[PDB]
Design a protein around this ligand. Sequence first.
Ligand SMILES: CCNC1CCN(c2ccncc2)CC1
Length: 185
Amino acid sequence: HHHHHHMVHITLDRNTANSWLIISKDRRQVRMGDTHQNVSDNKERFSNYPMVLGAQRFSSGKMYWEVDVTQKEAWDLGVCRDSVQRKGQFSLSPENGFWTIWLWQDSYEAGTSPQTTLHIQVPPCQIGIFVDYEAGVVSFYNITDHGSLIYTFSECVFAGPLRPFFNVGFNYSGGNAAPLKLCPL
Ligand SMILES: CCNC1CCN(c2ccncc2)CC1
């Protein structure tokens, strides 16, 4: 792909984070803490899952960013409507305002309803995310495997401003403490 020149500088929005997340000072890294991180509750926070939004809102144009997932067992990544449900249980689907992929139990899936099997020969250490607002496209690329295509959501009905979306996943196994990191341009 040749999307690198639409690179945008993504930072994480602390106010949207699940209360167990630790976001780095530069707002480019997030990990699961071993306890409540001593913040007040607010209506923005994801309550049930270890999720956080980027601060950036997109309503036009072409945007590209990269996320480091090295040594993680579980994570979700992509974009979502600014207006997604924050509280309680929900599925990651375009009907609920999410355009995501994930790693779970040694398999990679796209957040369709129902979910779609991905075919990845080289486990990614970095993921590229490309959004074309006007075209209605979200695409994911395997940076570790020379930028090979992982998945394209097309005919997307965004129906609002988009935000970068992250889930560091639970760490019940003790094998998923590693952070998500926004890679430098
Ligand atoms: C058959 C239903 N399975 C559910 C549990 C596992 N899952 C994930 C795993 C990781 N991130 C998001 C969703 C899909 C829904």
